[PDB]
Design a protein around this ligand. Structure first.
Ligand SMILES: Cc1ncccc1[C@H]1C[C@@H](c2cccc3nc(N)ccc23)Nc2c(F)cnn21
Ligand SMILES: Cc1ncccc1[C@H]1C[C@@H](c2cccc3nc(N)ccc23)Nc2c(F)cnn21
Lengths: 126, 126
């Protein structure tokens, strides 16, 4: 007789993230700039919040919710922040011997606990 | 010697989407209301654009970019729109014998071509 069905699209989340990275490339509906000393990164707050305890805290603070510019701590590496923003929008964490420690430091500052734990493994591997 | 590594987080996209659905539940950084005759659905424009040709077109139109309210065609089923918004934020398409045709109609209105094609299969299955 009658048949209700819940259908799982396994590629859906990945497709969403590709499309979110494409909006970011074309600067579509980006609503915040992240300033890392001399560098700037345009992003969507919702993606930052979804990926970072720190951005979650900032944009859930009802004062800071509407900020269009966020200045990161002077100590934060721009190259490392860039790697972690790419990771947020692609699921791909790109590590070099040269940056791994800066990436891990930035991940911890950003409260990206799973990225930090993966950084720990790469360190031992090398 | 030196070892660069690009690491794939297979669960990352799914985790992002869970967190995006949680922001929507708690109405955090939602920036549009979709009015379907008598009903309203708060959402994030970036997720709509990522999932729907129609919302892609609307929010890329530089006039309509900043709209906080979108009125859908009077003919559109609210129950069907709700199913497709849940699908956008969860990857799960929930179909009943009663709504499948309305879901497919709404998917096509929204330019969600992969959802329409899956609706076609369910129709034959039942
Ligand atoms: C509070 C909560 N409960 C259940 C599920 C999810 C959440 C939080 C988690 C938060 C988030 C992400 C990634 C690393 C995080 N690390 C920390 N130390 C803190 C928050 C972190 N991001 C997010 C959203 F965009 C929506 N909800 N949440
Ligand atoms: C233009 C383009 N080229 C390559 C890759 C992606 C895109 C478009 C596709 C568009 C979108 C989604 C889902 C069904 C769509 N159906 C239609 N008929 C039209 C657009 C549809 N959504 C989206 C973003 F949020 C960012 N980019 N894009």
């Amino acid at each position: 007789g009658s048949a209700d069905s819940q259908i799982q699209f396994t590629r859906h989340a990945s497709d969403v993230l590709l499309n979110l990275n494409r909006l970011r490339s074309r600067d579509i509906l980006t609503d915040v700039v992240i300033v890392v000393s001399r560098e700037q990164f345009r992003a969507h707050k919702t993606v930052l919040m979804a990926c970072s305890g720190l951005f979650y805290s900032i944009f859930t603070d009802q004062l800071k919710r509407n900020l269009s510019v966020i200045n990161l701590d002077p100590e934060i590496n721009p190259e490392g922040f860039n790697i972690l923003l790419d990771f947020m929008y692609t699921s791909r964490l790109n590590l070099r011997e040269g940056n791994i420690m800066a990436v891990m430091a930035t991940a911890m500052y950003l409260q990206m606990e799973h990225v930090v734990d993966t950084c720990r493994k790469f360190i031992k591997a090398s």
